[model samples]
Target: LSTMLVAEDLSAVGGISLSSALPVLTAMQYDVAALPTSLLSTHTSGYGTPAVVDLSTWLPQVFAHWTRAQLHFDQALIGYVGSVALCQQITTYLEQQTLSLLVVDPVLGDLGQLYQGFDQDYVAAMRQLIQQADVILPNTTEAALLTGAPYQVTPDLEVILPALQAQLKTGAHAVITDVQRADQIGCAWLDEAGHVQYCGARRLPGHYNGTGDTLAAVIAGLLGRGYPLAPTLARANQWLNMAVAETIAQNRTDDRQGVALGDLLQAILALNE
Candidate 1:
């Protein structure tokens, strides 16, 4: 089996970040080594302030052991490094390992602002890190932050897509999710061939926790499995739409619990079939 290093936050209670990514990627048949940047009592949504522990100090020890063991990964997905120090440390660690694929989910913030505890310096570090990525998954808000573009609900893909591409290594794909295109809402990306591609569904009712993490996990998983970028995006969008529809139908009092992905796990396992 191919191996992937998942560098994301872990939520003990809610299914976001590592909790959401681990299963999705594992179902795709990858032996995944999880590197949690931090630990959370729960995802920081409907849950009132979550207790957080920064794993910055512990991470270096993990890296030290891995280096001593001569361990390496076939691919990696990085998400939500809560501090600039951690971001730089992770980037340096990844640079030492030669990975076939590096998908950076630049989780800076949402709704046109940086997330709590992130700032321009963190953005600069993140910008430097993504330069090494083969694929980048940033939402519209993050795309704006990464490119210094004004936030727009209907952003000019022509402007931002190429800007994001210019920042990446050659032939890398830059995907902007949570994009609204007229009546439809989905993700748009500049394919490796420099063509724009989109896959979306009508706008869903409310934002659910873990959707972005799930989308990135599916894309990274399948891309590691040898699927091309565009088709992988389509499949990821299809699965996300299905899960969101199920979440809405279930009408859970709290959307923060995340999407209904129990049945969808089988769909991921079937990818190998």
Candidate 2:
């Protein structure tokens, strides 16, 4: 069997760390290949740094080769982009390939605003990508951007789930992460049967830069291995909740930078077994 493929802009530490987390997949016995969209010094974390190596020049070449090879992937996950042009390229690539699953972690924004360096046009470009996804993993702000709906922290899944599903007229499943209702922290998802499942946890008091990336990766990895959405999402949610709880219990950074991922992996395996 072939490795699952992930296409996204590569960060020296942050983005690369995502690929490293594939040991979680490997331990479960899945192989992974990551194709970078661009190389960056540090994540745009609202800090000042620019992308080096614009990927538009190379992505089409890579896509062409994959097309010619008829590379059938078990799954594909996407995040981060250098340009709207690259987003179009990715959409075209997805259109040409047949995969068992496609999960888009639309990394467009957080906390009421688009990420510091992303342009308004990139938001428009991501809508095109979302249309082709089999599963979309957008955080609250990115979901708002995709659906043109404003973000409100409420328990109303009725208000949120439909707005997300409306984007998938092509019939992609949906998972909305880092969701905050008035009184809790949680996630919500729509499965293939159109059933909505939600799991809420006590809100952790801080943030983690790669939480969405981590969660999306875990869910895609699980699904690629043949788990259904309900149990798969439940396990993913449990893993993330424990990761946050561990991060806070240690009095780690306000961003929960020091949280140990090792324990989370153990928790994931234990739960799966």
Expressed as tens digits, the lDDT of each residue in 22-70 for candidate 1 is 8888888999999899999988887899898979899989998999999
Per-candidate clashes come to 0, 0
Q: lDDT tens digits, residues 1-273, model 2?
A: 547777776666453335444655565556776788887766656436746677788889988887788776777888766588989998988887777788888888777788767877998899888887878887777777777777654435666778778878566676777776666666787655666767666667766666666777788888887897778777777777787677667664344242346777786677558
Worst 10 residues of 2 by lDDT: 251-260
What's each prediction's TM-score? 0.96, 0.85
For model 2 the TM-score comes to 0.85
Question: Candidate 1: which stretches are off by over 4 Å?
Answer: none
As a whole number from 0 to 100, the lDDT of residue 141 in candidate 2 is 79
- Reference-based lDDT, each prediction: 0.87, 0.72
lDDT of 2: 0.72
Q: Candidate 2: how large is its RMSD?
A: 3.0
